[PDB]
Design a protein around this motif. Structure first.
Motif, PDB file in Angstrom:
ATOM      1  N   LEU A   1      44.036  28.762  24.906  1.00  0.00           N
ATOM      2  CA  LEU A   1      44.172  30.166  24.548  1.00  0.00           C
ATOM      3  C   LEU A   1      45.519  30.386  23.961  1.00  0.00           C
ATOM      4  CD1 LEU A   1      42.517  31.551  27.760  1.00  0.00           C
ATOM      5  CD2 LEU A   1      41.409  31.335  25.498  1.00  0.00           C
ATOM      6  N   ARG A   2      45.631  31.423  23.143  1.00  0.00           N
ATOM      7  CA  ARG A   2      46.909  31.817  22.540  1.00  0.00           C
ATOM      8  C   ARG A   2      47.313  33.236  22.918  1.00  0.00           C
ATOM      9  NH1 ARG A   2      47.333  28.899  17.948  1.00  0.00           N
ATOM     10  NH2 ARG A   2      49.637  28.986  17.971  1.00  0.00           N
TER      11      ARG A   2
ATOM     12  N   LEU B   1      41.326  14.621  26.116  1.00  0.00           N
ATOM     13  CA  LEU B   1      41.713  14.768  24.773  1.00  0.00           C
ATOM     14  C   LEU B   1      41.771  16.235  24.368  1.00  0.00           C
ATOM     15  CD1 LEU B   1      39.048  15.584  22.875  1.00  0.00           C
ATOM     16  CD2 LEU B   1      38.432  13.159  23.382  1.00  0.00           C
ATOM     17  N   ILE B   2      42.586  16.543  23.332  1.00  0.00           N
ATOM     18  CA  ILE B   2      42.594  17.805  22.595  1.00  0.00           C
ATOM     19  C   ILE B   2      41.846  17.555  21.287  1.00  0.00           C
ATOM     20  CG2 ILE B   2      44.112  19.416  21.320  1.00  0.00           C
ATOM     21  CD1 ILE B   2      44.452  19.816  24.272  1.00  0.00           C
ATOM     22  N   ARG B   3      40.972  18.480  20.948  1.00  0.00           N
ATOM     23  CA  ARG B   3      40.205  18.485  19.701  1.00  0.00           C
ATOM     24  C   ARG B   3      40.316  19.860  19.105  1.00  0.00           C
ATOM     25  NH1 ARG B   3      35.377  20.943  21.080  1.00  0.00           N
ATOM     26  NH2 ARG B   3      35.059  21.139  23.380  1.00  0.00           N
ATOM     27  N   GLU B   4      39.816  19.994  17.876  1.00  0.00           N
ATOM     28  CA  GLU B   4      39.901  21.243  17.146  1.00  0.00           C
ATOM     29  C   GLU B   4      38.491  21.747  17.195  1.00  0.00           C
ATOM     30  OE1 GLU B   4      42.744  21.324  13.871  1.00  0.00           O
ATOM     31  OE2 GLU B   4      42.384  19.221  13.631  1.00  0.00           O
ATOM     32  N   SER B   5      38.305  22.892  17.836  1.00  0.00           N
ATOM     33  CA  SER B   5      36.965  23.455  18.085  1.00  0.00           C
ATOM     34  C   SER B   5      36.158  23.626  16.761  1.00  0.00           C
ATOM     35  CB  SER B   5      37.035  24.801  18.764  1.00  0.00           C
ATOM     36  OG  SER B   5      35.716  25.403  18.898  1.00  0.00           O
ATOM     37  N   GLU B   6      34.891  23.307  16.793  1.00  0.00           N
ATOM     38  CA  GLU B   6      34.049  23.610  15.629  1.00  0.00           C
ATOM     39  C   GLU B   6      33.344  24.986  15.764  1.00  0.00           C
ATOM     40  OE1 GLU B   6      32.453  19.641  13.806  1.00  0.00           O
ATOM     41  OE2 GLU B   6      31.543  20.020  15.738  1.00  0.00           O
ATOM     42  N   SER B   7      33.208  25.518  16.981  1.00  0.00           N
ATOM     43  CA  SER B   7      32.591  26.879  17.139  1.00  0.00           C
ATOM     44  C   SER B   7      33.618  27.991  16.965  1.00  0.00           C
ATOM     45  CB  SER B   7      31.962  26.993  18.532  1.00  0.00           C
ATOM     46  OG  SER B   7      32.958  26.826  19.525  1.00  0.00           O
ATOM     47  N   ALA B   8      34.891  27.661  17.078  1.00  0.00           N
ATOM     48  CA  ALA B   8      35.907  28.646  16.881  1.00  0.00           C
ATOM     49  C   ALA B   8      36.932  28.004  15.980  1.00  0.00           C
ATOM     50  CB  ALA B   8      36.512  29.037  18.228  1.00  0.00           C
ATOM     51  N   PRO B   9      36.639  27.897  14.676  1.00  0.00           N
ATOM     52  CA  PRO B   9      37.653  27.336  13.734  1.00  0.00           C
ATOM     53  C   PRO B   9      39.120  27.854  13.944  1.00  0.00           C
ATOM     54  CG  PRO B   9      35.609  27.612  12.598  1.00  0.00           C
ATOM     55  CD  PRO B   9      35.365  28.188  13.979  1.00  0.00           C
ATOM     56  N   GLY B  10      40.074  26.938  14.019  1.00  0.00           N
ATOM     57  CA  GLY B  10      41.492  27.326  14.201  1.00  0.00           C
ATOM     58  C   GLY B  10      41.920  27.413  15.668  1.00  0.00           C
ATOM     59  N   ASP B  11      40.973  27.223  16.579  1.00  0.00           N
ATOM     60  CA  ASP B  11      41.321  27.097  18.021  1.00  0.00           C
ATOM     61  C   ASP B  11      41.190  25.673  18.505  1.00  0.00           C
ATOM     62  OD1 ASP B  11      41.346  29.868  17.835  1.00  0.00           O
ATOM     63  OD2 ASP B  11      40.060  30.205  19.527  1.00  0.00           O
ATOM     64  N   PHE B  12      41.964  25.331  19.529  1.00  0.00           N
ATOM     65  CA  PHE B  12      41.792  24.027  20.132  1.00  0.00           C
ATOM     66  C   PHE B  12      40.978  24.086  21.401  1.00  0.00           C
ATOM     67  CE2 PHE B  12      44.567  21.902  17.213  1.00  0.00           C
ATOM     68  CZ  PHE B  12      45.458  22.880  16.794  1.00  0.00           C
ATOM     69  N   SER B  13      40.397  22.951  21.758  1.00  0.00           N
ATOM     70  CA  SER B  13      39.700  22.757  23.012  1.00  0.00           C
ATOM     71  C   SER B  13      40.219  21.511  23.679  1.00  0.00           C
ATOM     72  CB  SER B  13      38.217  22.611  22.744  1.00  0.00           C
ATOM     73  OG  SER B  13      37.794  23.807  22.140  1.00  0.00           O
ATOM     74  N   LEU B  14      40.132  21.557  24.989  1.00  0.00           N
ATOM     75  CA  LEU B  14      40.575  20.486  25.854  1.00  0.00           C
ATOM     76  C   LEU B  14      39.326  19.951  26.577  1.00  0.00           C
ATOM     77  CD1 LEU B  14      42.700  18.853  27.541  1.00  0.00           C
ATOM     78  CD2 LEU B  14      42.944  20.930  28.892  1.00  0.00           C
ATOM     79  N   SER B  15      39.116  18.636  26.454  1.00  0.00           N
ATOM     80  CA  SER B  15      37.985  17.964  27.096  1.00  0.00           C
ATOM     81  C   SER B  15      38.452  16.919  28.092  1.00  0.00           C
ATOM     82  CB  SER B  15      37.007  17.398  26.054  1.00  0.00           C
ATOM     83  OG  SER B  15      36.669  18.437  25.180  1.00  0.00           O
ATOM     84  N   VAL B  16      37.867  16.935  29.284  1.00  0.00           N
ATOM     85  CA  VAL B  16      38.422  16.123  30.404  1.00  0.00           C
ATOM     86  C   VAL B  16      37.327  15.540  31.255  1.00  0.00           C
ATOM     87  CG1 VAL B  16      40.103  16.054  32.272  1.00  0.00           C
ATOM     88  CG2 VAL B  16      40.149  17.948  30.615  1.00  0.00           C
ATOM     89  N   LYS B  17      37.393  14.223  31.518  1.00  0.00           N
ATOM     90  CA  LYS B  17      36.464  13.549  32.436  1.00  0.00           C
ATOM     91  C   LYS B  17      36.661  13.984  33.876  1.00  0.00           C
ATOM     92  CE  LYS B  17      34.885   9.418  34.609  1.00  0.00           C
ATOM     93  NZ  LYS B  17      33.540   9.238  34.019  1.00  0.00           N
TER      94      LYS B  17
END
Ligand SMILES: [Cl-]
Length: 109
Positions: free
Chosen positions: A58-59, A31-47
């Protein structure tokens, strides 16, 4: 079909994405989520096996999205590229859609 993506979970906490991905059977479930430690960045989480791995989205200077080197005009394009090119430098992990658990329909009038 014309469907919303099964992979965008908005502001779900890092730990909640781990909780949810931990129950997926298949390596690469993500899934893609919206990071809570870096507001305005996304994070990717993978099993991956008994683990859940997290990647910073990254941008570049123009707003294009990447994990390592190869960059795209959209998260959708980034995600789709990484279905057939590994997200990981240590293992071959290819993005695949979550199974889901999808929605019993109900009518509410
Ligand atoms: Cl690869």
């Amino acid at each position: 079909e014309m469907k919303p993506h099964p992979w965008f979970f908005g502001k779900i906490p890092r730990a909640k994405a781990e909780e949810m991905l931990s129950k997926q059977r298949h390596d690469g479930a993500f899934l893609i989520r919206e990071s809570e430690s870096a507001p305005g960045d996304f994070s990717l989480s993978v099993k991956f096996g008994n683990d859940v791995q997290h990647f910073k989205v990254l941008r570049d200077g123009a707003g294009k999205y990447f994990l390592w080197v190869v960059k795209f005009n959209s998260l959708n394009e980034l995600v789709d590229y990484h279905r057939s090119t590994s997200v990981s430098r240590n293992q071959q992990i290819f993005l695949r859609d979550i199974e889901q658990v999808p929605q019993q329909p109900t009518y509410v009038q």
